[PDB]
């Protein structure tokens, strides 16, 4: 299937993808864990401050679309079913989850940025590996998940952006 | 809990903990994926050659002891295996990404040095400095839910000591 997640659910999806790798002792996240992860001051562009009922609306919609699943602990925790599940067709490598997650949470970035900003979800040995992982995401037969943008002035690196939010222009 | 994991069980647990972080696209693992991971030539000490039924018997025992889980989906007859060892919902053992990385490398390759563990556990957790490696190891030894690693005495010339996990029972110098 194809995705056009809004910027809110792309953030919620990115938060659960991030905490699953960086903090496995708190995964799966509860509703409060999703609220806190969305409103973080670091590694979040743009910095948001969502209501509790706001992400709950987004948690429930992503559940009905089967991108999330509810786990009962009375507290209800949420696990990501966006990739690397036992049924879903979307299978990502550890490097691909890192680049995709950092793109959903931080928007359009360049391979130089994605190397350091995704280093804790996947340590890239060289800046070629971040460059091959992004290309692979764009030449997959499952459709492209990554697009390259036009170079910005005075810089030798062109930015990349995920395609789970639909149309991309520049 | 009390952990008396055999040499075979520690390798089985170590493989599933490793592939969960390194290869998320193939986790959970089938019985053949576990066999392949146990008999790997790289990142394994000792290098094993376990049969499939030898691995199936270990998987069956740890699933009963609630160290692993059987995942069964509709339409698919291939049974996959997830780890119940740490960071589950009912289980009490919680481990950070750095602690999972160090314990997994200790389960898979035996008694190792902090400088050794950093190079070999980086694909499961990139440490900032070796102080992080020694801080994580010293955490696992001083936690009140049980000592998880032990620090051995230094061999003649070494200026670093080796650490070993405590989930396989008795450890000596």
Curated annotation (Swiss-Prot), chain A:
Q: Which residues carry this modification: N6-acetyllysine?
A: 77
- The lineage's top-level taxon is Bacteria
Q: Which UniProt keywords apply?
A: Acetylation
The UniProt similarity line reads: Belongs to the UPF0502 family.
Q: What is this protein called?
A: UPF0502 protein YceH
Q: Which organism is it from?
A: Escherichia coli O157:H7
Shown segment, full-protein numbering:
1 to 173 of 215
UniProtKB/Swiss-Prot annotation, chain B:
Q: Which domain of life is it from?
A: Bacteria
Keyword flag Acetylation: yes
List keywords of the entry alphabetically: Acetylation
The signal peptide here is none
Q: Which residues carry this modification: N6-acetyllysine?
A: 80
TM annotation in the entry: none
Q: Which family does it belong to?
A: Belongs to the UPF0502 family.
| Protein name according to UniProt | UPF0502 protein YceH
Q: What organism does the UniProt record list as the source? A: Escherichia coli O157:H7
Gene name of this polypeptide? yceH
């Amino acid at each position: 299937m194809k995705y056009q997640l809004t910027a809110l659910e792309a953030r919620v999806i990115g938060c659960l993808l991030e905490k699953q790798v960086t903090t496995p002792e708190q995964y799966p996240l509860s509703v409060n864990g999703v609220v806190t992860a969305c409103n973080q001051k670091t590694n979040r562009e743009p910095v948001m401050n969502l209501s509790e009922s706001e992400v709950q609306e987004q948690l429930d919609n992503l559940v009905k679309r089967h991108y999330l699943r509810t786990v009962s602990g009375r507290v209800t925790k949420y696990e990501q079913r966006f990739c690397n599940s036992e049924f879903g067709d979307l299978k990502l490598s550890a490097a691909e989850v890192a680049l995709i997650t950092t793109l959903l949470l931080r928007g359009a970035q360049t391979p130089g940025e994605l190397r350091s900003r995704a280093a804790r979800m996947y340590e890239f040995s060289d800046m070629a590996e971040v460059e091959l992982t992004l290309e692979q995401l764009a030449n997959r037969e499952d459709g492209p998940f990554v697009v390259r943008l036009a170079r910005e002035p005075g810089k030798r690196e062109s930015r990349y952006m995920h395609l789970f939010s639909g149309e991309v222009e520049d």
